[PDB]
Design brief:
Chain B: Pathway: Nitrogen metabolism; urea degradation; CO(2) and NH(3) from urea (urease route): step 1/1. The structure holds 3 protein chains of 3 kinds. Chain A is 26% helix and 21% strand. By secondary structure, chain A is of the alpha/beta class. In chain A, the strands form 4 sheets. In chain A, strands 9, 10, 11, 12, 13, 14, 15, 16, 21 and 22 form a 10-stranded parallel beta sheet that branches. In chain A, strands 4, 5, 6, 7, 8, 17, 18, 19 and 20 form a 9-stranded mixed beta sheet that branches. In chain A, strands 23-24-25 form a 3-stranded antiparallel beta sheet. Chain A is globular, with a radius of gyration of 24 Å. By secondary structure, chain B is mainly β. Chain B has one domain (1-122): Urease, subunit B (Ribbon), CATH 2.10.150. Chain B has 1 helix and 10 strands, in the order ββββββββββα. Chain B has one helix at 106-115, and strands spanning 8-9, 14-16, 23-30, 36-39, 51-52, 61-63, 70-73, 78-85, 91-92, 101-102. In chain B, a hairpin with an 8-residue loop joins strand 9 and strand 10. The longest helix of chain B has 10 residues, at 106-115. In chain C, helix 1 crosses helix 2. The longest helix of chain C has 21 residues, at 5-25. Chain C starts with a helix and ends with a strand. Classes of the chains: A alpha/beta, B mainly beta, C alpha+beta. The complex binds nickel (II) ion (2 copies).
């Protein structure tokens, strides 16, 4: 007996060779392989397969290869591939990617993916499943920012801040032992994974280091605190001892040095370069030249992504209003004009497409949108396909190569850069079960269900008083993973090795899972999945033209984007 | 070219289910006065007692229908269905408690079925 | 007023439908959330008028047409479901393929 492909895909989600459009973009992803056994697909419901004696095993105890949760029929989009599989979760972690069910009567069942009495089922047929987004440029300014991030599929926030204090409104910094301890305590009630950055500023080691020992997971060097050679140097020395990452927003003003001076202070050490294009901050006008170096892990923030006809106007004014600039004072305007450049923003689209900028991030509430990292990543990929055509490396009509290059920017690469990719950042066996389900029509726009540590934390769901959950109004809502003590077991506080060894979690009464920051001083640009290109980026000091391999990198701004007015109420 | 957000573009061809497994066609009759609907993956010899068919032919088999679908028998309806072979370890536990072990034990399964009145044992 | 949880949530559907109707009245092609809001509020107000579930299931397919909405919106909306207090208590209305 045979099933035609259209019918197959409607029932079980797509299978090998089938393609799916991402939202209302022009981008197509193709199923590369499928772990199922045709005819023994898992599914749940009345008269369906996962029933006792059938696709559900009625013999094994939980410990005997039985799952806590099976996501059936997922279309996985990840750096590791675009393929169809069942996903098995146990103790909060992804334990199996393969074929789930009952070995009694089914062929091809992954041995530790038994559906038993202990197993919960999530039907992923017809959905795209990705890792939770890793946002490594977060300002902790307003607690309402967390649902905003969860609704666009972000599950980890790395950054700093104490709320709406001017230090935190400008810089991703939680300064000093006491602020760090207070924000670790605050973090106990935020339904998302968190890592806190201390102030990467000082001329003595101790003041910096004590922040790491208190529980910070890394450091931020920002020009508003003095992004000087000394502060860069001391932070990187602390980082190299502590095994944590340093992010940098360099000296825009070129006050103590030009880009080459900042690079000489860095001295070959590993560093994460935030908003590398430089509209978000950085040596004017040539900070984006950092993205060509081997020891730099480069990210963009999102308001420049991608280059649109309103981008410059909105930035020029944004910059003026947050710096209290005046169009009357000539220096103020020369400053704005040196910082907000059409030439570098256009080239940032193309550096993303080439794999030269490895990561995306938000800059949430400081100069970036908390719920648009995922959104703008895909809008950028879509714009580049239209302007540059499919990358040479593509297949059929698939955009699979570009899709793995771009999903990597907000999942695995940020995790790698921050020393937390043993726990999060990709759909792989042995990693925390932070998983986002998307309807294809809403892909990258609004997440269906966000799973945190193997329990749903956030969902687009309807009237709580109705007979069923689908009646209006359907809106993003916190789920049971966020309630009571469950918020501790489904989320991770990422901390330095020294704060963990010193018993900070116990000193402060932290109940959240504690994740260890590690392995981030011996990585480089070569470790950025699908985005590992090192090259000589030239930024002309007079015209701000960007050249890579002797060619000018230019593209036009677009008037319209997908994943925009078809979806949003405002 | 009209954009349907999230639409599929499926490849050409058909998907063959339960490929390379032996198929068997049998006649089954619902001798009861209420409707019986049977799922794809229930061990076929352990279905409702009132379904009359050669019970030996259900052993170690299930319906050869798309995973998660079911065959329906109205009161008094007789029709042919096609079965396919169970896979994996070819063991069945629970359900109607007729097998509880290997499906190779046909005489034991048929003895339990006959004693409990599952219609159609020789 | 003694508002319960659902009454207040559902007020927001009415509001979103007022917003969308204004947008439609100044000539715009409606988007996904706007179309859903207009059809949902139509159903709720029809239940408040005393229509039957079967009447609203028919009428709901004629509130907005494809030329009222953006490209692809018809195909994004497979159904619209809403629960409202009819004269005989709360009932569920499901409008299948409301826009074609
Ligand atoms: Ni910055
Ligand atoms: Ni920032």
């Amino acid at each position: 007996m045979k099933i035609n492909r259209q019918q197959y895909a409607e029932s079980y989600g797509p299978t090998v060779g089938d393609e799916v459009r991402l939202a209302d973009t022009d981008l197509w992803i193709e199923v590369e392989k499928d772990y199922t056994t045709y005819g023994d697909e898992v599914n749940f419901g009345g008269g369906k397969v996962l029933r006792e004696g059938m696709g559900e095993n009625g013999t094994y105890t939980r410990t005997e290869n039985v799952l806590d949760l099976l996501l059936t029929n997922a279309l996985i989009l990840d750096y590791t591939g675009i393929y169809k599989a069942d996903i098995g979760v146990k103790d909060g972690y992804i334990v199996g990617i393969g074929k789930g069910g009952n070995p009694d009567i089914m062929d091809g069942v992954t041995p530790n993916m038994i559906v038993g009495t202990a197993t919960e089922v999530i039907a992923a047929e017809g959905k795209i499943v990705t890792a939770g987004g890793i946002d490594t440029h977060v300002h902790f300014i307003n607690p309402d920012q967390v649902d905003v991030a969860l609704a666009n599929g972000i599950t980890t926030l790395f950054g700093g801040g104490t709320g709406p204090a001017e230090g935190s409104k400008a810089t991703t910094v939680t300064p000093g032992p006491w602020n760090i301890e207070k924000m670790l305590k605050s973090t106990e009630g935020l339904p998302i994974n968190v890592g806190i950055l201390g102030k990467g500023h000082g001329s003595s080691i101790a003041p910096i280091m004590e922040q790491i020992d208190a529980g910070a997971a890394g450091l931020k060097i920002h020009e508003d605190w003095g992004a000087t050679p000394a502060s860069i140097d001391r932070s990187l020395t602390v980082a190299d001892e502590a095994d944590v990452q340093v992010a940098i927003h360099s000296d825009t003003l070129n006050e103590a040095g030009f880009l080459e001076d900042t690079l000489r202070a860095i001295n070959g050490r590993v560093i994460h370069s935030f908003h590398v294009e430089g509209a978000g901050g950085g040596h004017a006008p040539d900070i984006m030249a950092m993205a060509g170096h081997p020891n730099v892990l480069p990210s963009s923030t999102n308001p420049t992504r991608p280059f649109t006809v309103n981008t410059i106007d909105e930035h020029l004014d944004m910059l003026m209003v947050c710096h209290h600039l005046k169009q009357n004072i000539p220096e103020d305007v020369a400053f704005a004009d040196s910082r907000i450049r059409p030439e570098t923003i256009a080239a940032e689209d193309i550096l993303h497409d080439l794999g030269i900028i490895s990561m995306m991030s938000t800059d949430a509430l400081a100069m970036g949108r908390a719920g648009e990292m995922v959104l703008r990543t895909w809008q950028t990929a879509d714009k580049m396909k239209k302007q540059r055509g499919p990358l040479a490396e593509e297949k059929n009509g698939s955009d699979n190569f570009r899709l793995k290059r771009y999903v990597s920017k907000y999942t695995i690469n940020p995790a790698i850069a921050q020393g937390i990719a043993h726990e999060v950042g990709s759909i792989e066996e042995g990693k925390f079960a932070d998983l986002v389900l998307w309807e294809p029509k809403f892909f990258g726009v609004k997440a269906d269900r966000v799973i945190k540590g193997g329990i749903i934390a956030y969902a687009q769901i309807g009237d709580p008083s109705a007979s069923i959950p689908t009646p209006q109004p359907v809106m993003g809502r916190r789920m049971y993973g966020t309630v009571g003590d469950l918020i501790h077991d489904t989320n991770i506080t990422f901390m330095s090795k020294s704060s963990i060894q010193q018993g900070v979690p116990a000193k402060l009464g932290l109940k959240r899972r504690i994740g260890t920051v590690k392995n981030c001083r011996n990585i480089g640009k070569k470790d950025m999945k699908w985005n590992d290109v090192t090259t000589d980026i030239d930024i002309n000091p007079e015209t701000y033209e960007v050249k890579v391999d002797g060619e000018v990198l230019t593209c036009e701004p677009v008037k319209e984007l997908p994943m925009a007015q078809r979806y949003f109420l405002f | 070219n009209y954009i349907v957000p999230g639409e599929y573009r499926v490849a050409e061809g058909e998907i063959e289910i339960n490929a390379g497994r032996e198929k068997t066609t049998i006649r089954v009759s619902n001798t009861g006065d209420r409707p019986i609907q049977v799922g794809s993956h229930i061990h076929f010899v352990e279905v409702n007692k009132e379904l009359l068919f050669d019970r030996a032919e259900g052993i170690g088999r299930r319906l050869n229908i798309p995973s998660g679908t079911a065959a329906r028998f109205e009161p008094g309806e007789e029709m042919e269905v096609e079965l396919t072979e169970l896979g994996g370890n070819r063991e069945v536990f629970g359900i109607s408690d007729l097998t509880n072990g290997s499906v190779d034990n046909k005489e034991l399964i048929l003895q339990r079925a006959k004693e409990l009145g599952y219609k159609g044992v020789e | 007023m003694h508002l319960n949880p659902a009454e207040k949530e559902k007020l927001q559907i009415f509001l979103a439908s007022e917003l969308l109707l204004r947008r439609k009245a100044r000539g715009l092609k409606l988007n996904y959330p706007e179309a859903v809001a207009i059809i949902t509020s139509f159903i709720m107000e029809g239940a408040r008028d005393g229509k039957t579930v079967a009447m609203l299931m028919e009428e709901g397919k004629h509130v907005l047409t494809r030329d009222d909405v953006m490209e692809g919106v018809p195909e994004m909306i497979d159904d619209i479901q809403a629960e409202a207090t009819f004269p005989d208590g709360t009932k569920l209305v499901t409008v299948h393929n409301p826009i074609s």
